[PDB]
Write a structure and sequence with these properties.
Blueprint (H helix, E strand, L loop, with lengths): L7 H12 L3 H10 L43 E6 L4 E6 L7 H10 L4 E4 L4 E2 L2 E2 L12 E3 L4 E10 L3 E10 L4 E10 L11 H13 L10 E4 L6 H17 L5 H8 L10 H15 L7 H9 L1
Parallel strand pairs: 2-10, 3-9, 3-10
Antiparallel strand pairs: 1-2, 4-5, 6-7, 7-8, 8-9
This protein binds ligand A1ETK.
């Protein structure tokens, strides 16, 4: 193979983009190369109060459908990358009248974890409804037949983990859902450091919630594309590298954009993605004696 390290091709490209100050031109290339696909159901008149933003819609070919409901629509997309054995659902922060649909989808898709990357209020606007209880009262969603109870809360400096009990009233069953809340990632911004984002991702991974024996994890922010796209791109690229593939980050992101529009919203969020993939690749453990020496020396 090549003479460089496993991350050497990506690291050289990052250094060149910095020296030539070409992050804004590269972002514009990606925008111009992203094709549009039909999103007709999202624009039905009966779905207008189910969309948070008029310009952010799921594509018809990859939207998640609600089962046994008169209206099957929710603003959510299935992003499945079988080269990585990874599947995610990316979705908007639910509105007061769509929290009931959010929990129905979580049940029907056999999801184990919800990853939340926004605050409820940001710059004096509401970005997402309060869809889980903060105290010991049960929170009822009568339109779809679900109730939710807080089981535990662990607060750290830049994220919080809640364990939640989700009850299906119609089937007489319950499940424990892990709720991973990143509390210090600003709208259209970046996390405080690669190290802080990576510690959060490794905690999500350690719970088993991203493994193929569970349904897809539900990832959301406010619109479900900027911060959510950054999180999913970094996780996918790290899986492919651990598998041994020689990856091109521009190509992976354009492929993921075929499943949901507009993933990654600023040039700085793109640059942060490169940084987190390089530093995470140095944390990979494996069997190769060569790869271990590269890690020590780097
Ligand atoms: O970093 C990020 C940025 N996000 C984000 C976004 O991408 C788009 C919009 C959006 C779409 N239409 N309109 C607005 C805002 C105001 C008026 C109209 C809002 C957002 F918070 S995000 O996806 O939540 N993660």
């Amino acid at each position: 193979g090549p003479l460089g390290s496993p991350w050497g091709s990506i690291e050289r490209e990052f250094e060149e983009l910095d020296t030539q100050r070409r992050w804004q031109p590269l972002y514009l290339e990606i925008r111009n190369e992203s094709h549009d696909y039909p999103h007709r159901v999202a624009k039905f008149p009966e779905n207008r109060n189910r969309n948070r933003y008029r310009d952010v819609s799921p594509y018809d070919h990859s939207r998640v459908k609600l089962q046994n409901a008169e209206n099957d629509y929710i603003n959510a997309s299935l992003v499945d990358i079988e080269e990585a054995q990874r599947s995610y659902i990316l979705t908007q922060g639910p509105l007061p009248n769509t929290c009931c649909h959010f929990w129905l989808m979580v049940w029907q898709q056999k999801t184990k974890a919800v990853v939340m990357l926004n605050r409820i209020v940001e710059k004096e606007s509401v970005k997402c409804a309060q869809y889980w209880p903060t105290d010991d009262q049960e929170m009822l969603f009568k339109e779809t037949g679900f109730s939710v109870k807080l089981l535990s809360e662990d607060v750290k400096s830049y994220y919080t983990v809640h364990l939640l009990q989700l009850e299906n009233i119609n089937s007489g069953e319950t499940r424990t859902i892990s709720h991973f809340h990143y509390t210090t990632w600003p709208d259209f911004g970046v996390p405080e450091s690669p190290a802080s984002f990576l510690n959060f991702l490794f905690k999500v991974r350690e719970s088993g919630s991203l493994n193929p024996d569970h349904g897809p994890a539900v990832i959301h922010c406010s619109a479900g594309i900027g911060r959510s796209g950054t999180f999913s791109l970094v996780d996918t690229c790290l899986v492919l590298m651990e598998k041994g593939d020689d990856i091109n980050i521009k190509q992976v992101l354009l492929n993921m954009r075929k499943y949901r529009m507009g993933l990654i919203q600023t040039p700085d969020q793109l640059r942060f993605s490169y940084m987190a993939i390089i530093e995470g690749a140095k944390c990979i453990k494996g069997d190769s004696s060569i790869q271990k020496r590269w890690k020590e020396l780097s």
